[PDB]
């Protein structure tokens, strides 16, 4: 399915929202409910569907940051990232 990435977020917009409160950047880590993740709540009003990152991993989502796997509600360690 050909979706857009979701709103960027975090330090200098280097990160992509993976769900309302999860802002992960490839070279950043993942902010889950921190300040860095603020913009990610706006994605909820945008009427178009989005999906962040490529390599789809785990619980339902896809690799968000170095070895982390988040979907729209959870980030777990997962080295398959």
């Amino acid at each position: 399915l050909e979706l857009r990435q979701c709103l960027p977020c975090g330090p200098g917009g280097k990160g992509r929202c993976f769900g309302p409160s999860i802002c992960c950047g490839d070279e950043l880590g993942c902010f889950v409910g921190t300040a860095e993740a603020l913009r990610c709540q706006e994605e909820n009003y945008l009427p178009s569907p989005c999906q962040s990152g490529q390599k789809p991993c785990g619980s339902g989502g896809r690799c968000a940051a170095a070895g982390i796997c988040c979907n729209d509600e959870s980030c777990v360690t997962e080295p398959e990232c």
């Binding site: 399915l1 979706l3 979701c6 929202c17 993976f18 769900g19 309302p20 994605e43 909820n44 009003y45 945008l46 009427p47 178009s48 569907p49 989005c50 999906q51 339902g60 989502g61 979907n71 729209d72």
Partner: peptide, 9 residues
């Protein structure tokens, strides 16, 4: 919206 959470779909 997050594909997983979008209205209708």
């Amino acid at each position: 919206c997050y594909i997983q959470n979008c209205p209708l779909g």
